[PDB]
């Protein structure tokens, strides 16, 4: 009655903290947010955060809900 | 699936058409939209929801 699964979507973090990225570089692929778009980072339609600017990757909890953001710092 | 393919044809006289879908049994109104025509580079009315 079972037997079906799907192809694995290769989600997760592609560039970790302190990594230097070019602009347009995908930083995290995700389904929901689970990671919000901080400075110099777009959200994308499937919520794929991506570097809007060259610089280093920066994760930080910030906000009234302790949500993880991702900034980009040149 | 049970939505047919229609052929949005421009008003600018050029042969440029868009194609899209439509619930034919729900909506029998001829869908008309002001879309872009690359042959004339203006927004014109597209018609004829097949």
């Amino acid at each position: 009655r079972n037997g079906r699964d799907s192809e694995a979507k290769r989600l997760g973090v592609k560039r970790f903290g302190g990594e230097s990225v070019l602009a347009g570089s995908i930083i995290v692929r995700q389904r929901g947010t689970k990671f919000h778009a901080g400075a110099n980072v777009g959200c994308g339609r499937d919520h794929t955060l991506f570097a809007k600017a060259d610089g280093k990757v920066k994760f930080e909890v910030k906000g009234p809900k302790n949500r993880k953001f991702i900034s980009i710092e040149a | 699936g049970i939505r047919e393919k229609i052929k949005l044809v421009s008003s600018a006289g050029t042969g440029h058409f868009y194609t899209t879908t439509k619930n034919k049994r729900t909506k029998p109104e001829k869908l008309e939209l002001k879309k872009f025509d690359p042959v004339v580079r203006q927004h014109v009315i597209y018609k004829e929801a097949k």
Partner: protein, 64 residues
Amino acid sequence: PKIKTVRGAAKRFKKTGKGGFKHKHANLRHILTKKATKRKRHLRPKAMVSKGDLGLVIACLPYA
């Protein structure tokens, strides 16, 4: 005897200047209403044959 070109390959590929092969993209024949216009826009330029496929193509096209 001479090597016979795979003639169905000689219509899919053309050899370029540095030695590789250009080819039309697949997935742009029919069933296009459902395809996005961005996706159909990127299949319109000719692409270069990949690394792993190139040994299969020069086998097919010896007089390219």
